[PDB]
Symmetry: C4
């Protein structure tokens, strides 16, 4: 109809209720489920769906052997109905590639897939299910993007890309698209020293992205975008409650404009909702691996370098595998506020469970409640022994 | 369009004709069918569909092992086309949880799923396929609901919940929702001493619920709701024709305001249509187990403590497994009256058939006819030996 | 929109072109295809689909054992997209039963399924996917119907039923339905001595049904219905070109008002287009079994007791299995005439191929062409050896 | 809405970006994927889909044995969602046959399937999913057509057919259809000596077809059609950059009106975009077999007998199997020009990989970009060893 505009502020997050779970690996043990990774969730005005990067094979299929690898010519961005598994028969391919992002602007959806060899990748921007624009690699080193939904405001949908080293300074760009066409792009500015896989959400005409400093920081970089001025800023979450993984143990004081040191060249896609006292951070429980997952209310986390948790909710037990996590919201729901939501990628298989030769995941997602709900843990649920 | 209003009275029930049957277990022996239980049927203005609680695995899948258990993080309310089986590819997830209810109000559908650990469950109310409201456990003991469709009148859709012990007094509440939001709630009142899994239907602006007194009664409690005054009453079916299971043998006189004694701490979801002489009761044939199923016309069953059958129809032979049963009607059919309908859950597997490690079911449903139709029996039809 | 009216006459049939073929048994050897029999084809104003009586199991499933049997509680009328196979995932159940008919009246579709034990069957008439009317058995001996589409004119859709013996005189009725409700019914009149499974089509406000005299005749009985006067007549095809199976060898003169003798208590559903010189008859090639299939132009077959073929087209080789055949037309196509069409049921399995324990079929259908097209043969194509 | 008119010219082709890839053989190793060949891509005003000739069996099914054969009664033209594989459950049958073409005219789609024995084949033209016209074989020797999409202009959709020998002069015809009816047909004229499987596209009210001279030429014949005058011409691509396969090595000067000699009685369906300097030719890399695939910019290839490449892009490595290739464009995209697109059939199985008894393929397709994008290679990706 008309372009959606980020006119509301976030609803108060007093707890998280279960939104969707596909139990993909469990079901896929005996049905035609595609092997995936890098999942996310994204809504259209009339439907919300699960998204992911398929590996172009079923989990039980012999081609599942080797799916720990990230970039092949057999991958594609696919979407399928909420809480269903990604099956060969219900999955819709949005585009071909090994890194992607996608968002609805109110009138139609923009999907971006990047493919190619390491030194010659290219992104192709699809709008209304048609290819519209193409961007060639600018640093010739794995052009890559969000791995979660982008956000739009009055037709403008910014997207963060990175090209170059994942363990050194790199060339990150913020592209402002409208109807799949480039209105403008900027180089990253601010104090964030390295950006990877931004998780974004919008409220009151401002887009907030919590990303991954794969180089030096265990605290997360944050990119705030103004989609009207088409300008942005960058810093890190000030809080000592560190949210990347692997990471050092929490200090008593964090860093606002520098990576918090202790772990180099590694990390995990993650997210947060930075909204004053209504601030919640997600993180794996383990400081060593993609294990467990929790949400912690850390009032003023973004700007208070001594902020510590005031409330919390466990999402996945430390005795269960987790993985990527990101933000999305249903900008087309009824009400006066935007209900914050997120998903956690529950990775199964390699490298942690090497008795099988594949790597895949299932998805669990929650949204906020103004009630103070009791908590449960949501593991993948599959028994690897069954796949042997 | 506009909210549906219960303006008609029931059609005269002279017999029952076959409405739907999915033969799920038979078909699922060699196809991707989800393991389920707690099924029901519910209509939208333009389509009627089967519903159930999936176990997040196929019947032939190795994860089918253990599905006798009720509450796990892998369950979800799913719906699928009438008479089809619940397959991995045609099932639509309505919400995540291990207890549910669902009903269309004329404009859109409300679905409710409850999940969580025993002492910290929470219900989330979805309306128009979006989460709208959340209710936390109030007695910290398996918050649970109908397991069959709710009914709406002018936007108001009451739903009965119970929280606390299943073998003692508990805290039952009647919630009146409108567009997924709570208008009001009451504590249970009347003479029913314990309520579990209410089966409901509406006619002439009154909602009638036949439930399960899991504590002491073998006669069924009944809750009549006024969705306009948003008030209700409760009693038991007076009739000596006892309809819970397990149960004592029928007496010559029943009880109107107390549980009929003889069997404690057990029962089965069941239903009835209480309409003066046009009164029909459903029950398992066996007084000992979920075996067989029949419909008996017991004129004035609700109010006549000596009412006995005047006509009957066998639905399932006592030599075949049955299970849950409940009411639903197509409030959007043509005509001057509401045609009463019901479904019977045909449970296969554990605990009665322990040669297999799973527990599932298929569905059979009938609706009333003003004709006096010949009868047939409708078993599940699967040969367990095939699954060995 | 508006009720369709049979306003056109038939197109000139100069040959038959291929319309649809699902290769169900071939494909089903390694995919989830339901076991069926008694198929047909029927169109809606915007789509034409395949129909059949499912056996409630896949062909490879263990429950396929025993599907030679006709009437069980696991059967249902299902429809699915033209030329696709009847799979567990794309088949739509129209109603539950072991005998059926179905037709679109222009506004919506009426489907009829009969179920029950031999002495207590009942038909339930569905209209707009809702049960509307029910008819109880009148002779208490396998109430049964067409097994192919009915035809409508200005809302009136006649359907022929038979109840009683299949090897003696029986009680056949012509029901005139409108919006699923009974407007009127008649007992069969005319000279046809026994009616079974009528194949019908309409043109210029007249409905012609070619049926099966299972009792004594090897020539086919014909029922012509006036859907406006709601009256009918009956006779046999006069032609010596006999079209039932099994049958005697063709004589030089046929019978117009009596069964042509030679074979008792057996037959096969078949059809014909009786239109003066534009008259074509279908029949199995073998006079002994459901083997092969051909179309023969026999000008004035209905009224000329010495009519013999003037042209022909082989549909299936005598070295391939055939079975049921019936008529249907797309009353909603463009043009000035109705293009005659038909399907042939290609039965595989029992009783002729008893190395397997199942019985199923695939479908092939042709429509007429005013061109004189070359011919090909269309067998089922599956290798039974593969199923062993 | 209204008939589409070829009002735009081609976009400038500076490179090719990835459009779709179904990874059919990979996925089909463990899921219900139909065996196919002769694929293509074609768009409707609101969706673009993959098309192919199914073999009426899954790849893993036992009936896959023997699918190297071209013409059987089990084949059919099927279409399915872009980038999905052709599965038993998502494939839509357009018509029955072993040679086909299909195109949308703006209002609806015309699909053509030819079937029959070698000496008695017939084409049936479907429009709006209904059979409308039929054409009988005129040379009684495998009537056959494009195997890729046709193109329409103001309702007129020309289609090229050939009937007669594939290794000698034959009878090629250009049919001009409108709403599935024949407006006119011509015999082939011009200097092309033999035509097979034309690949077509339209721009500025002109339709260009690049075909296959299976008889003598290794250069490709070209048929340019005027859909308004309903007239055409024919010649060969002048360029020495030979594009059929098998073929001699490139000379320094090509032939404009005669086949370039060196290889007889063989070839492969291929295509090109002939647009002055904006001219790109596709060809297998190997001159000996259907191996590898590349795109070469050969300015003025059609008219310059000494034209050689000025730029290029590899699509498939010479160490990977390729096959058929053809043109299609989304005539309903936004913008001022038509974005040229093409697909390459990646054949797996027989005859090159005879360890398996089947022959099938997967599809990869690209569209043009005005950017100068980096290149990647796109192989089928399946490991034959897995199928053993
Ligand atoms: C039914 O449901 C309800 C609703 O969920 C249940 O009630 C909830 O209970 C939750 C668990 O108790 C509770 O969550 C905790 O909240 C704490 C904050 O609340 C307390 O402090 C505030 C502030 O003073 C008070 O207002 C409040 O009244 C409380 O006293 C959090 O602080 C907790 O998080 C910390 O602990 C967990 C382990 O429990 C860690 O995993 C987590 O990371 C936090 O601790 C680490 O990080 C901090 C900060 O740097 C460090 O100080 C600390 O040492 C830990 O650091 C180590 O561990 C991390 C992670 O491994 C590592 O990185 C680091 O290097 C160190 O190794 C926790 O979130 C809910 O708030 C509460 N909800 C509500 C509404 O009440 C109820 O129990 C359920 N009922 C039943 C019967 O089960
Ligand atoms: C073709 O189709 C038609 C249509 O269906 C068939 O005709 C139907 O036939 C049915 C079976 O006969 C019949 O159903 C019965 O109706 C009885 C009522 O009718 C009779 O009584 C009335 C009232 O006086 C008369 O008007 C009428 O004319 C008849 O005479 C019911 O009473 C029957 O139910 C009881 O019996 C069945 C077993 O048949 C039990 O399973 C059932 O639970 C009922 O009996 C128990 O409960 C009562 C009440 O407390 C006790 O008194 C009794 O002792 C039993 O109690 C024990 O069993 C229960 C359950 O196990 C247990 O809990 C308890 O503790 C005790 O152990 C029955 O419903 C249809 O009405 C009739 N339909 C029509 C339209 O005619 C026709 O036969 C078919 N044709 C052919 C050829 O097959
Ligand atoms: C390319 O395609 C075209 C288009 O299809 C092919 O041309 C077609 O060729 C068909 C086969 O030849 C042909 O079909 C036949 O037509 C005959 C009628 O035509 C002839 O007679 C008329 C009338 O005089 C002449 O006008 C005309 O010019 C011809 O001379 C039919 O009569 C044929 O049917 C009979 O034969 C077949 C076997 O071929 C039987 O299976 C069939 O049942 C008919 O014969 C039985 O029944 C009759 C009637 O009672 C008996 O008299 C006879 O004895 C047989 O009875 C026995 O068999 C039956 C069945 O088993 C049994 O019940 C009974 O008891 C006895 O045992 C046949 O239909 C097409 O018309 C013709 N089409 C066109 C447009 O030309 C062309 O060949 C193809 N090209 C190539 C190169 O292959
Ligand atoms: C990142 O991505 C970019 C974008 O793709 C990459 O850059 C591209 O690099 C491509 C490969 O180098 C390049 O493709 C080539 O372009 C040549 C034309 O360019 C050159 O000549 C022009 C004209 O003078 C100059 O303007 C220009 O500046 C260049 O100097 C083509 O000519 C190439 O095609 C020929 O070679 C390939 C092998 O490379 C053959 O397979 C192909 O068939 C062509 O050669 C055969 O045919 C010709 C013509 O008859 C014969 O002369 C020749 O002998 C060969 O004939 C034999 O082989 C054929 C096929 O087997 C057989 O039939 C015959 O009988 C003989 O046996 C080639 O297309 C892109 O244009 C370039 N793109 C861009 C934008 O720059 C970049 O490298 C990537 N980065 C990294 C780091 O990898
Ligand atoms: C069910 O009852 C309510 C009345 O209580 C009907 O609501 C009225 O509908 C018309 C058109 O929607 C409005 O102009 C009235 O104000 C509506 N409501 C109220 C609450 O007064 C409703 O239309 C009835 N439903 C149906 C199907 O007829
Ligand atoms: C088929 O015939 C009936 C007439 O018998 C047509 O019905 C008339 O349609 C118009 C518009 O629907 C009404 O105003 C007339 O009163 C209708 N009916 C009768 C029964 O008189 C019907 O429209 C015809 N069908 C079609 C497709 O033209
Ligand atoms: C390539 C660098 C990038 C960010 C560190 O790495 C990612 C890390 C991954 C990971 O940490 O699991 C998985 C992603 N599939 C991969 N992205 C690509 C494009 O391969
Ligand atoms: C938990 C108490 C409740 C009512 C007695 O028990 C039910 C009995 C069941 C049963 O008797 O079969 C099955 C239901 N799955 C279960 N409900 C839940 C929420 O577990
Ligand atoms: C029952 C008599 C009727 C007509 C002769 O028989 C049919 C014959 C059949 C047959 O000849 O193959 C198959 C049908 N499934 C069957 N109909 C029913 C209802 O069982
Ligand atoms: C029959 C002649 C024709 C053109 C040379 O051959 C084709 C060649 C083929 C090929 O070279 O792979 C495959 C096509 N399936 C076939 N067409 C038909 C109708 O069989
Ligand atoms: C099928 O059923 C028969 C009869 O019940 C049984 O003897 C036979 O062995 C079964 N065959 C198979 C393959 O199950
Ligand atoms: Ca890091
Ligand atoms: Ca009880
Ligand atoms: Ca399988
Ligand atoms: Ca007979
Ligand atoms: Ca050639």
């Amino acid at each position: 109809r008309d372009f959606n505009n980020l006119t509301k502020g976030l609803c108060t997050i007093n707890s998280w209720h279960i939104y969707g779970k596909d139990n993909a690996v469990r079901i896929g043990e005996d049905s035609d489920v595609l092997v995936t990774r890098e999942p996310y969730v994204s809504c259209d005005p009339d439907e919300c769906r699960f998204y992911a990067l398929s590996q172009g094979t079923t989990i039980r299929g012999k081609h599942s052997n080797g799916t720990i690898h990230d970039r092949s010519q057999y991958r594609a961005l696919i979407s399928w109905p909420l809480s269903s598994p990604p099956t060969v028969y219900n999955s819709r391919v949005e585009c071909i590639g090994w890194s992607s992002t996608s968002c609805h602007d109110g009138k139609t959806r923009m999907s971006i897939c990047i493919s190619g060899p390491n030194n010659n990748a290219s992104a192709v921007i699809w709008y209304n299910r048609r290819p519209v624009t193409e961007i060639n690699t600018w640093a010739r080193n794995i052009l890559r993007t969000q791995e979660s939904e982008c956000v739009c405001h009055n037709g403008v949908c910014p997207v963060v890309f990175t090209d170059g080293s994942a363990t050194g300074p790199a060339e990150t760009r913020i592209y402002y698209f409208k109807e799949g066409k480039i209105l403008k792009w900027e180089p990253l500015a601010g104090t964030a020293k390295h950006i990877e896989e931004c998780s974004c959400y919008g409220e009151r005409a401002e887009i907030t992205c919590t990303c991954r400093d794969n180089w030096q920081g265990s605290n997360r970089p944050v990119i705030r975008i103004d989609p009207v001025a088409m300008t942005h800023t960058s810093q890190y979450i000030c809080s000592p409650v560190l949210t990347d993984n692997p990471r050092p143990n929490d200090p008593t004081v964090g860093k606002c404009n520098d990576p918090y040191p202790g772990n180099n060249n590694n990390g995990v896609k993650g997210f947060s909702y930075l909204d004053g006292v209504n601030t919640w951070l997600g993180r794996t429980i383990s400081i060593a691996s993609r294990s467990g997952y929790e949400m912690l209310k850390v009032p003023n986390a973004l700007t208070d370098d001594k902020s510590k948790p005031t409330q919390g909710q466990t999402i996945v037990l430390n005795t269960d595998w987790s993985g990527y996590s990101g933000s999305f919201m249903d900008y087309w729901a009824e009400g006066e506020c935007y209900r914050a939501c997120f998903y956690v990628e529950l990775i199964r298989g390699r490298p942690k469970e090497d008795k099988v030769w594949w790597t895949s995941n299932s998805i669990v997602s929650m949204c906020s409640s103004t009630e103070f709900l009791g908590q449960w843990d949501w593991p993948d649920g599959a028994k690897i022994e069954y796949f042997l």
